[PDB]
Enzyme design. Structure first.
Site, PDB file in Angstrom:
ATOM      1  N   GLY A 101      11.799 -30.088 -14.984  1.00 50.61           N
ATOM      2  CA  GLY A 101      12.621 -28.624 -15.288  1.00 50.61           C
ATOM      3  C   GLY A 101      12.426 -28.256 -16.093  1.00 50.61           C
ATOM      4  O   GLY A 101      13.387 -26.979 -16.351  1.00 50.61           O
ATOM      5  N   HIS A 126       2.321 -23.419 -19.251  1.00 51.18           N
ATOM      6  CA  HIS A 126       1.190 -24.406 -18.144  1.00 51.18           C
ATOM      7  C   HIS A 126       2.371 -24.382 -17.087  1.00 51.18           C
ATOM      8  O   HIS A 126       1.869 -24.593 -15.597  1.00 51.18           O
ATOM      9  CB  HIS A 126       1.655 -25.910 -18.625  1.00 51.18           C
ATOM     10  CG  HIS A 126       3.151 -26.716 -18.820  1.00 51.18           C
ATOM     11  ND1 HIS A 126       3.558 -27.391 -20.629  1.00 51.18           N
ATOM     12  CD2 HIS A 126       4.450 -27.191 -17.658  1.00 51.18           C
ATOM     13  CE1 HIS A 126       5.451 -27.411 -19.310  1.00 51.18           C
ATOM     14  NE2 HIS A 126       5.454 -27.403 -18.314  1.00 51.18           N
ATOM     15  N   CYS A 156      11.471 -28.027 -18.824  1.00 55.19           N
ATOM     16  CA  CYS A 156      10.510 -27.541 -19.674  1.00 55.19           C
ATOM     17  C   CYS A 156      10.816 -26.047 -19.783  1.00 55.19           C
ATOM     18  O   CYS A 156      11.472 -24.860 -18.988  1.00 55.19           O
ATOM     19  CB  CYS A 156       8.485 -27.163 -18.521  1.00 55.19           C
ATOM     20  SG  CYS A 156       8.183 -28.548 -18.752  1.00 55.19           S
TER      21      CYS A 156
HETATM   22  O1  LIG Z   1       5.803 -29.868 -16.107  1.00 55.97           O
HETATM   23  C1  LIG Z   1       5.847 -30.864 -16.693  1.00 55.97           C
HETATM   24  N1  LIG Z   1       7.096 -32.298 -16.236  1.00 55.97           N
HETATM   25  C2  LIG Z   1       7.282 -33.261 -17.237  1.00 55.97           C
HETATM   26  C3  LIG Z   1       8.176 -33.791 -17.877  1.00 55.97           C
HETATM   27  C4  LIG Z   1       9.460 -34.799 -17.270  1.00 55.97           C
HETATM   28  C5  LIG Z   1      10.529 -35.013 -18.076  1.00 55.97           C
HETATM   29  C6  LIG Z   1      10.285 -34.144 -20.065  1.00 55.97           C
HETATM   30  N2  LIG Z   1      10.237 -33.096 -19.792  1.00 55.97           N
HETATM   31  C7  LIG Z   1       8.939 -33.066 -19.024  1.00 55.97           C
HETATM   32  C8  LIG Z   1       6.306 -33.355 -18.061  1.00 55.97           C
HETATM   33  O2  LIG Z   1       5.696 -34.183 -19.266  1.00 55.97           O
HETATM   34  N3  LIG Z   1       5.348 -31.864 -17.989  1.00 55.97           N
HETATM   35  C9  LIG Z   1       3.969 -31.520 -18.337  1.00 55.97           C
HETATM   36  C10 LIG Z   1       2.926 -32.963 -17.396  1.00 55.97           C
HETATM   37  C11 LIG Z   1       1.741 -32.318 -18.324  1.00 55.97           C
HETATM   38  C12 LIG Z   1       1.197 -31.583 -19.472  1.00 55.97           C
HETATM   39  C13 LIG Z   1       2.731 -30.800 -19.625  1.00 55.97           C
HETATM   40 CL1  LIG Z   1       2.638 -29.223 -21.199  1.00 55.97          CL
HETATM   41  C14 LIG Z   1       4.187 -30.881 -19.727  1.00 55.97           C
END
Ligand SMILES: O=C1N[C@H](c2cccnc2)C(=O)N1c1cccc(Cl)c1
Ligand SMILES: O=C1N[C@H](c2cccnc2)C(=O)N1c1cccc(Cl)c1
Lengths: 304, 304
Positions: A143, A41, A145
């Site tokens: 951030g 992503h 990820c």
């Molecule tokens: O880029 C991001 N950042 C967000 C985040 C916030 C807090 C903790 N971890 C991740 C999140 O969920 N996304 C995401 C949104 C949609 C699809 C995917 Cl793969 C990922």
């Protein structure tokens, strides 16, 4: 003595963290040998995440569009490919700090350490468990990820998790290092609910053995039970059914303490039916399930 | 979102851990520049620990009696000295992995990460708080002596603790990196009881702000209180008295959430008087006090 939620030393993993930018999106990558692993992503924009066609999106991207920065130095990208939900960026330099490593797909109920990272930089380390519903109750912000989960066996790092998303419920979803998601989750900004989360029974029992080893014995009783009697209680309290495999792994803890597994099950049965009555166990007011029997043995014996 | 007991990444500290042996006693040392720091009780034998005369014991020891091993390579000892309860062994080689570092004496209520070590090898990392009674509720076994506690500010490691002993109560005592014990403890195998341990009020309030930030708001109420009213309750429940300095440090958390500090105090007052009623806060069934206001801000903003 003492019992803590201990993470593995994170040094070997810190030396693998890089920053990956594609377009205007930045996330964490894992540099092992001449390959950088990161969530696919990274190629998406906010408009794309509603329903992304990753194959079509990656077609508009060349090696030069992926910016990989290790500390303050840039890595040169010579290849790129998509494997399930991860991108593998071939760089021209092998990471000199690559530890001995493996990619492993852990089972639900198993534990691992997470090195939370932002912009390729490590911020903290904590111990996690893969929930039976394949989510992790982590601590991740935008951030984070690309942050990875791992275990360490002496000098070998077994990478087991890569963080991808946070569900609207505040729980986290991610993949193994081959890009396969744990659970039914897809890398898409769509409402995805996690299933019912059960308590990892074998881990709560392992933690009760850790408590006995460290002096907390108030919960021990004069009773015993059978696997079938215990499981009737476990089902009512949304605990995973205990099997003979679970009893078998509790064997070293049973041998060390002299408390038979089924006897420890009877203590757990009474704790489930009566609560803690305001008391604590290893400084906790609830039944802890994020310590496997292996974690208990390792911490109570000092495996380095 | 999510809130975890997070430790600092331990890499910079792992590169400083060595094994120190003197006679038949082996413990951990901390190699910074051309000096190895370790607990002075490395010169003791089991007979000596009842009432050791460290000055007389060190007189029977030469540089060649201290064996310092970094990984698999031996360090050559060219000087030795005792500073309070630590030995400083001058080696002929500066540690190439010495990070930017400071020695700091933390205050009770402050937190730090511990890298537990055995035979100079790291086994795990966990977050701790210096209790108001100057003990730490750690996880340490025989051989863990010399393990250090630290904090990290970007690239600088502030070493604050060195593990020395476990009290008969299972709690841990140790020194700062100048060899001065935290609390009234002496490095002697004698019964030493810790004082009354109070709950770190400013940290519980910081953790309640972390809970509100992460969605757990059931405990918020329609009440407020004053510092004097709140402190009457804090004294009854063995909580540290809250001061205007504590309110001042809670300011950023108060500003972010829009909940005035005294209003959060009223929620804490009701939680202390009524309990949790079977509910949880950030996955805990008790009031957590091992997160400072700084830890909450850092974790909730992603400081790397
Ligand atoms: O880029 C991001 N950042 C967000 C985040 C916030 C807090 C903790 N971890 C991740 C999140 O969920 N996304 C995401 C949104 C949609 C699809 C995917 Cl793969 C990922
Ligand atoms: O050598 C040891 N190892 C013990 C240990 C056990 C578990 C955790 N930490 C330390 C201990 O307490 N002592 C000690 C005994 C007497 C005086 C001093 Cl300074 C130290």
């Amino acid at each position: 003595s003492g019992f803590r939620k201990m993470a593995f030393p994170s040094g070997k993993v810190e030396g693998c963290m890089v920053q990956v930018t594609c377009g205007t999106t930045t996330l964490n990558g894992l540099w092992l040998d001449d390959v950088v692993y990161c969530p696919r992503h990274v190629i998406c924009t906010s408009e794309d995440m509603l329903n992304p066609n990753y194959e079509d999106l990656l077609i508009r991207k060349s090696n030069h569009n992926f910016l990989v920065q290790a500390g303050n130095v840039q890595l040169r990208v010579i290849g790129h490919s998509m494997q399930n939900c991860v991108l593998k960026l071939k760089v021209d330099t092998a990471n000199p700090k690559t530890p001995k490593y493996k990619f492993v797909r852990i089972q639900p109920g198993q534990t691992f350490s997470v090195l939370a990272c932002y912009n390729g930089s490590p911020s903290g380390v904590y111990q996690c468990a893969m929930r039976p519903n394949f989510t992790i109750k982590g601590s991740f912000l935008n951030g984070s990820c690309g942050s990875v989960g791992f275990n360490i066996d002496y000098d070998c790092v077994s990478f087991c998790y890569m963080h991808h998303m946070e569900l609207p419920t505040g729980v986290h979803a991610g993949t193994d290092l081959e890009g396969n998601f744990y659970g039914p989750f897809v890398d898409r900004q769509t409402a995805q609910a996690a299933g019912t989360d059960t308590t990892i029974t074998v881990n709560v029992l392992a933690w009760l053995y850790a408590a006995v080893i460290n002096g907390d014995r108030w919960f021990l009783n004069r009773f015993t039970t059978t696997l079938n009697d215990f499981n009737l209680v476990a089902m009512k309290y949304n605990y995973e059914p205990l099997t003979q495999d679970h009893v078998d792994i509790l064997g070293p803890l049973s041998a060390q303490t002299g408390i038979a597994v089924l006897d420890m099950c009877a203590s757990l049965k009474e704790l489930l039916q009566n609560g803690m009555n305001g008391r604590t166990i290893l400084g906790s007011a609830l039944l802890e399930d994020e310590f496997t029997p292996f974690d208990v043995v390792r911490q109570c014996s000092g495996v380095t």
